[PDB]
Design brief:
part of a larger assembly, 9 chains, A mainly alpha, B mainly alpha, C mainly alpha, D alpha+beta, E alpha+beta, F mainly alpha, G mainly alpha, H alpha/beta, I mainly alpha, E: alpha+beta, 3 strands, H: alpha/beta, Rossmann fold, four-stranded parallel β-sheet, binds 1,2-Distearoyl-sn-glycerophosphoethanolamine, binds iron/sulfur cluster, ubiquinone (chain I), transmembrane (chain I), NADH dehydrogenase (ubiquinone) activity (chain I), transport (chain I), translocase (chain I)
Chain lengths: 209, 74, 90, 176, 96, 303, 70, 156, 171
């Protein structure tokens, strides 16, 4: 929940100030008054929809400072869960965009998919969402036997379900006519204003970390 | 040329142009006028017998007057 | 007065519903105004148009066809005029 | 390597532009969307009947905070304070006293279930595996006093069952 | 293929034991898929394991009345199951 | 016997609306992967009975309004329109055989526009006034179009009597001599009943809710009557009652099913859409339905 | 599945079935097996008024069939 | 006592009517909002229990305080709580809300939410896995089943 | 529920015209004009009564007081009875009941007329075969013979459209 103060000529604008800081929690000072391994879940849950790439970034920060390369099986498992987290966060971005725009049901279809992904997180770490699970210095407590077949079956079924989402929306005329005309991003402004990620992938210049 | 930009406009102008022009060419508007004329709302009032009229038959079975026979043949 | 009886029954039963629902628990913009008078003038021309199915039964049909097309064509001229002169845009 | 979207042009063949204009005038892919949604209407719904069919879980769920004890024996804990040191919420509070037997023991062992973020660090930090993240997650507490557990609430929570927790630990003592 | 599902839909009703007994489990909450009867249980209650349904409708409990003396015909609770059936019921295993 | 007819017509509308709430919640539930409401009793019927009686129990927010008498006067008007407005619609033999009833339908819809405006004025401060003012504008935007399409679809039927309509739709349904006119009419009925894809984003919410869903059932009954209907045999009219109720049910399900799967429109996109897409095309269909029966030599036998 | 939405649809359809059957039954019941005569135009009204006048009982549905020719 | 019999049966009826639907408002600041959405998911229904997610605080039956409550937020939270109809009930969901939680020893975090509103049902977990929240809502419904409101109105 | 019902509806019509001739807030004025138009519709439907009162019901009570309340919403506020409005309402009701009493218990009260004081069932047709409810085919004749009239009517309304857009800042 954000506060927004917009000063507007009517059904239009003049200015718009997003007042934010409402969800402030003292995270940096609290990490300053703890150790590394104790204060890992702060970086697990400061960003909360993505849940393992944040851990991967903090683990790579501590590993890059500490000069320790993880073993390669931990690296490939970390790649797998980074792609699971990427899939989950992009599909939640799509569905909360759709639910805030209207468009009731594909939200629920893809949250059935995300319920299966939380089942995968349960079988791997044990908790529902906030798998700590990525220690700096390699991944802790590897996955139990009888998981890769489940991931493979999910991969096939989710390929079919994302094709059926593209069937549902995406060349729908009035959702297109809702969002085509609005929100251009100049590449000069895309580099000055410090946009990142999907903004850089969409607004022209080719850039992937 | 214009069929890609504003197609509902062009469809509306086409059906409007045929709704204006199309009532000219007709073998049917004469039938429209005959059927619409031949419906008696009011009473058919009779007339005084003899101004020496060798027409206008007295029994309504007599076909001397103009009957209607294009009705039952559609 | 029999549909007045139906009207009275509907009104009294609705007031019973409202009184049980209440006594048992105890600047502007210019662009809004264009739509108003636009509705008003086009609804007046609809008021002209709507007795047309009363009129189809007469012995003078060509003039009625011509002037009915003239009325709807004038309504189209008014709509196309405000369309071309940026009347309802944003 | 890249694969970018939306680089074409609308065609100039009359058939393609009249197919697009037919989509415009005739509400076609809207009806195809209705067909897709009815195709998901005629599936069977994947709802679980909750109080009779409970949800699937893992062997290593992190729940109840129940202590354990020895086979036909006494309390498993030591008051060695490793769980209190590793506890990131600092919800563990331990006061120790030794008893007449000579072996070291406790007096007070409080978990702030309000503060507990349910990590697993106290599960993985106990050298004798005394404190265990329990199996079930059904707390649902009216007052605010009852979410502050004593040692006796934890031991009654670990003596209402251990065979569950023993089955889980005997299932997965090899990973951790 | 029309009367057969209507014929099979009677088979869990007349197979249940009667009409008011079917009405009791219908008015309890929902379940009409009776017929496997895997595990009876001390403090009364029963456990039904089926394989013909999807993952999530394998195993369901049906509670009995007065298991504490509290008239639990209505208002059934969680944690009314003993813990070995709590290992079995949450699909942490395949052995009853 | 006349007040008995009145009671048998206006008592079951409450049962109709509450069971419509369970019907649309279960239909949206099976459009999703949901069951429910099915835990509360057999398949959730006393659950709409229960939440209706709960919302009558639940204590109102104290006003905090202005002109309390006007706050009384608006929802009483909405619900008395929803009560009075099933009269000439023929379930086989209608309640009052009128010379003209469809202009009465459109005028009562305009009175519903009045009720929405009065609730929006008497409710609260400025932002509720602006939102309800835009809602009144997007409700009033369509009594041009729907009345125009009504005029075009019964120009092929001569009289306003609606029993000549239930006669002259015996051979083929009137969906076939006007499919685009009827489709634009159904879009305008979605606009009159004001559901998704047409946006919205107080008290009594029960009565607001009641007037809206009775308006929905009314517009779908008038949809079924206006466009189709099978043959009426006297001295057995239960056949026509059954077939009428079945097709009105199917079209109400299709109505909610069109609500179920589309995003809401932007407001200026909605006005742009209505004017610059429907209104020249409705005029063109009017003038072609004027020029057609003089070319088929078939003006309707206007009694 | 949708086998259990059909009880709700069926009950709401029965709640929509009652005014049609009740209205047609009361129209066939209020004139002794006849139908309620309609009067859109004054010709039918004068015909109905002389019909209710000649029957003697001051009710139009009886309608004095052929037993008073001479 | 036929009057006491009538008052007991009518109190049972109206308390059943109260516990029937209980449509909430989803307040939902942080990741507990995502978990409320995931008990709004197609697997765990809410409509089976009469519960409907809804952004209307003018008619909401219960209020689910979920997420980390801060000082910049708490006047707005209680101002939402004050324009709520007077039969009102509160579910505190999540470690952050039911006693401060992980950001406890910190400025600009209200230590719990008893410092703002009264709390009826605490449901802990971080996030409380949706089965636990649903059992908490069942215990809230049984709290509504035990009210004896009209009996106290009789013998008052 | 008696014979003088057109007279009674006329009295409620004058009640409404006094009720918003007392100069209230304009939303109360619009409410009073809707009440007056509804009972005037009742009067003209009681004189038989086919089309014209159901026609005014769509226009004034369908699309004119809507625009009046719309303009009351967008332009004025009237943010918060008075002795002037209540005094004018009492004097109007006084004039009403004074005229009604002095007509009902006499022959006539005249501004300059001769008002025969009794119920207006007189005058009416003697049950003739009208067969089309005369006003219906009357306004149906508005298109066959109405050559000049609808031409200047439509031209006046088209000019009204261009007038409104010019005054509200053409183009
Ligand atoms: C309302 C309405 O329009 O009622 C119409 C009704 C007369 O019916 P109508 O279709 O005009 O046919 C002519 C004779 N039946 O009109 C009437 O029956 C007149 C009723 C007048 C009394 C009630 C006035 C309420 C205002
Ligand atoms: S780590 Fe284990 S033995 Fe040590 S104090 Fe904690 S529970 Fe006791
Ligand atoms: S799970 Fe974490 S917060 Fe909870 S007691 Fe253990 S270490 Fe502390
Ligand atoms: S209690 Fe846990 S899951 Fe909930 S808001 Fe706090 S960090 Fe997120």
């Amino acid at each position: 929940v954000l506060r927004l103060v917009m000063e507007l000529s009517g059904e239009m604008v003049r200015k718009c100030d997003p007042h934010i800081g409402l969800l402030h929690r003292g995270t940096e000072k609290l990490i300053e008054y703890k150790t590394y391994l104790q204060a890992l879940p702060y970086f697990d849950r400061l960003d909360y929809v993505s849940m393992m790439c944040n851990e991967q970034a903090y683990s790579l920060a501590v590993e890059k400072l500490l000069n320790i390369q993880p073993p390669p099986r931990a690296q490939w498992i970390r790649v797998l869960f980074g792609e699971i987290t990427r899939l989950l966060n992009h599909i939640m971005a799509v569905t909360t965009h759709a639910l805030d725009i209207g468009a009731m049901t594909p939200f629920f279809w893809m949250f059935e998919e995300r319920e299966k992904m939380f089942e995968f997180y349960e079988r791997v770490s044990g908790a529902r969402m906030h798998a700590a699970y990525v220690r700096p210095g390699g991944v802790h407590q590897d996955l139990p036997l009888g998981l890769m077949d489940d991931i493979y079956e999910f991969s096939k079924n989710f390929s079919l379900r994302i094709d059926e989402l593209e069937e549902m929306l995406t060349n729908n005329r009035i959702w297109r006519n809702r969002t085509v005309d609005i929100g251009v991003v100049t590449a000069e402004d895309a580099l000055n204003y410090g946009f990142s990620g999907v903004m850089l992938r969409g607004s022209g210049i080719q850039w992937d970390l | 040329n214009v069929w890609a930009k504003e197609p509902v406009l062009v469809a509306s102008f086409a059906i409007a142009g045929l709704a204006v022009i199309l009532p000219t060419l007709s073998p049917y508007t004469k039938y429209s006028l005959m059927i619409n004329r031949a419906t008696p709302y009011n009473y058919p009032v009779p007339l005084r017998d003899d101004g020496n009229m060798p027409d206008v038959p007295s029994h309504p079975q007599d076909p001397q007057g103009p009957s209607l026979e294009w009705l039952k043949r559609l | 007065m029999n549909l007045m009886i139906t009207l009275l029954t509907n009104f009294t039963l609705a007031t019973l519903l409202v009184t049980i629902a209440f006594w048992l628990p105890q600047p502007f913009s210019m662009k809004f105004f264009l739509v108003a008078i636009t509705f008003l003038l086009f609804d007046l021309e609809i008021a002209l148009l709507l007795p047309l199915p009363w009129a189809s039964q007469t012995t003078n049909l060509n003039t009625m066809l011509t002037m009915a097309l003239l009325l709807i064509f004038l309504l189209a001229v008014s709509l196309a005029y405000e369309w071309t002169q940026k009347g309802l845009e944003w | 390597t890249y694969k970018y979207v939306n680089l074409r042009e609308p065609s100039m063949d009359m058939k393609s532009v009249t197919d697009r204009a037919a989509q415009t005038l005739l509400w076609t892919e809207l009806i195809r969307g209705l067909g897709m949604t009815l195709s998901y209407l005629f599936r069977e719904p994947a709802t679980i009947n909750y109080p009779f069919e409970k949800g699937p879980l893992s062997p290593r769920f992190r729940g109840e905070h129940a202590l354990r004890r020895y086979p036909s024996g006494e309390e498993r804990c030591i008051a060695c304070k490793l769980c209190e040191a590793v506890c990131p919420a600092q919800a563990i509070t331990i006061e120790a006293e030794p008893r007449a037997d000579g072996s070291r023991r406790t007096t007070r062992y409080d978990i702030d279930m309000t503060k507990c973020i349910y990590c697993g660090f106290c599960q993985e930090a106990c050298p004798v595996d005394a404190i265990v993240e329990g199996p079930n997650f059904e707390f649902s507490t009216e007052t605010h006093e009852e979410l502050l557990y004593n040692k006796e609430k934890l031991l009654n929570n670990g003596d209402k069952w251990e065979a569950e927790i023993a089955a889980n630990i005997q299932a997965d003592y090899l990973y951790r | 293929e029309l009367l057969q599902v209507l014929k099979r839909g009677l088979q869990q009703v007349s197979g249940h034991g009667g009409l008011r007994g079917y009405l009791r489990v219908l008015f309890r909450a929902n379940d009409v898929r009776v017929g496997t009867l895997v595990g009876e249980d001390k403090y009364g209650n029963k456990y039904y394991e089926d394989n013909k349904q999807f993952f999530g409708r394998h195993r369901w409990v049906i509670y009995t009345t007065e298991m504490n003396g509290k008239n639990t015909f209505w208002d059934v609770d969680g944690s009314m199951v003993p813990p070995e059936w709590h290992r079995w019921l949450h699909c942490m295993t395949d052995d009853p | 016997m006349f007040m008995i007819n009145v009671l048998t017509l206006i008592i079951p509308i409450l049962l109709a609306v509450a069971f419509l709430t369970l019907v649309e919640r279960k239909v949206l539930g099976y459009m999703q992967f949901r069951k429910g409401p099915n835990v509360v009793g057999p398949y959730g019927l006393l659950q709409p009975i229960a939440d209706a009686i709960k919302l009558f129990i639940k204590e109102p927010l104290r006003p905090a309004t202005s002109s309390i008498s006007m706050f009384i006067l608006a929802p009483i008007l909405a619900l008395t329109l929803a009560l009075t407005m099933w009269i000439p619609l023929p379930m086989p033999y209608p309640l009052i055989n009128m010379n003209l009833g469809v202009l009465f339908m459109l005028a009562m819809s305009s009175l519903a526009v009045y009720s929405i405006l009065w609730s929006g004025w008497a409710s609260n401060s400025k932002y509720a006034l602006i939102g309800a003012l835009r809602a009144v504008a997007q409700t009033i935007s369509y009594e041009v179009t729907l009345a125009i399409i009504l005029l075009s679809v019964l120009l092929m039927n001569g009289s306003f009597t609606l029993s000549t309509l239930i006669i002259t739709q015996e051979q083929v349904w009137l969906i076939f001599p006007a499919w685009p006119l009827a489709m634009m009419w159904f879009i305008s009925t979605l606009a009159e009943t004001n559901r998704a894809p047409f946006d919205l984003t107080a008290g009594p919410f029960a009565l607001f809710f009641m007037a809206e869903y009775a308006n929905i059932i009314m517009m779908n009954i008038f949809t079924t009557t206006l466009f189709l209907g099978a043959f009426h045999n006297p001295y057995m009219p239960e056949l026509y009652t059954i077939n009428f109720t079945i097709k009105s049910l199917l079209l109400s399900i299709t109505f909610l099913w069109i609500r179920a799967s589309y995003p809401r429109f932007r407001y200026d996109q909605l006005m742009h859409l209505l004017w610059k897409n429907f209104l020249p095309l409705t005029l063109a269909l009017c003038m072609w339905h004027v020029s057609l029966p003089i070319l088929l030599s078939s003006i309707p036998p206007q009694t | 599945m949708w086998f259990e939405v059909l009880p709700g649809i069926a009950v709401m359809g029965v709640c929509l079935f009652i005014p049609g059957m009740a209205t047609a039954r009361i129209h066939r019941f209020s004139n002794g097996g006849r139908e309620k005569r309609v009067a859109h135009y004054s010709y039918q009204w004068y015909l109905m008024e002389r019909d209710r006048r000649v029957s003697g009982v001051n009710r139009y549905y009886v309608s004095k069939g052929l037993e008073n020719i001479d | 006592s036929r009057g006491e019999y009538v008052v007991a049966k009518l109190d049972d009826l109206i308390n059943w009517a109260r516990r029937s639907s209980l449509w909430p408002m989803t307040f939902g600041l942080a990741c507990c909002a995502v978990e409320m959405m995931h008990m709004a998911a197609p697997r765990y229904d809410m409509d089976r229990f009469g519960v409907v997610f809804r952004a209307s605080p003018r008619q909401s039956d219960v209020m689910i305080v979920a997420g980390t409550l801060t000082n910049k937020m708490a006047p707005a939270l209680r101002k939402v709580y004050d324009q709520m109809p007077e039969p009102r009930y509160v579910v505190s969901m999540g470690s952050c809300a039911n006693g401060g939680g992980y950001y406890h020893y910190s400025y600009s975090v209200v230590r719990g939410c008893d410092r703002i509103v009264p709390v009826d049902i605490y449901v802990p977990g971080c996030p409380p896995t949706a089965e636990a929240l649903l059992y908490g809502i069942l215990q809230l419904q049984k709290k509504i089943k035990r009210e004896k409101r009209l009996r106290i109105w009789y013998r008052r | 529920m008696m014979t003088y019902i057109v007279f009674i509806l006329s009295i409620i019509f004058v009640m409404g015209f006094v009720g918003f001739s007392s100069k209230p807030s304009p939303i109360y004025g619009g409410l009073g004009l809707i009440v007056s138009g509804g009972v005037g519709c009742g009067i003209v439907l009681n004189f038989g009564g086919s089309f014209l009162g159901l026609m005014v019901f769509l226009i004034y009570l369908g699309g004119m007081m809507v625009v009046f309340g719309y303009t009351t919403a967008m332009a004025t506020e009237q943010y918060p009875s008075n002795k002037v409005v209540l005094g004018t309402f009492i004097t109007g009701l006084l004039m009403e009941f004074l005229m009604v009493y002095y007509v009902l218990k006499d022959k006539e009260v005249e501004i300059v007329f001769k008002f025969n004081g009794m119920g207006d069932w007189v005058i009416y047709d003697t049950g003739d075969s009208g067969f089309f409810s005369e006003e219906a085919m009357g306004i149906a004749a508005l298109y066959s013979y109405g050559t000049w009239l609808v031409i200047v009517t439509g031209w006046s309304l088209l000019i009204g459209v261009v007038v409104i857009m010019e005054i509200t800042r053409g183009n």
